Symmetry: C2
Subunit: 89 residues, 2 copies
């Protein structure tokens, strides 16, 4: 929808140059992944990830515990309906 | 907005899990950068990057030449009007 914003060539030498830009929040299409012990609802950790990530690895988990993990898409001020999983370490 | 799809918990250990998902192509967003000697016919290098990369670095330009640079956003089959910047090496 929106063109990239800012936009600056920097370090322009004789044979080289760096092109720089931004992207608005408008089209910043993102993944959020929340996770925590399932029956402690207040314990939720959020990870935001680039649209291009297709996986993530949660660490520092407690042995023998059941976890819930919730997964949404986010673009600007629209979010998807959540997608929930539950697993037990 | 479409949620993440598939979605599996894989490789559960006593302290780690792996979450996996994918998104439909429809929803991916990148930048298409095109650059070349401003006013000369032909050439051009065109690069497509993911929304993750805010910068890109270019090389093998001619020592004291004007270039023009064009950046479009892409989300699916839609694109933006371009944003364009000339510069002289």
């Amino acid at each position: 929808l929106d063109a990239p914003s800012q936009i600056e060539v920097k370090d322009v030498t004789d044979t080289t140059a760096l092109i720089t830009w931004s992207m608005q929040l408008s089209q910043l299409e993102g993944i959020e992944l929340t996770y925590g012990i399932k029956d402690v609802p207040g314990d939720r950790t959020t990870i935001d990830l680039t649209e291009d990530e297709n996986q993530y690895s949660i660490g520092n988990l407690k042995p023998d515990t059941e976890y819930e993990v919730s997964l949404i898409s986010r673009r600007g001020d629209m979010s998807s309906n959540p997608a929930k999983e539950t697993f037990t370490t």
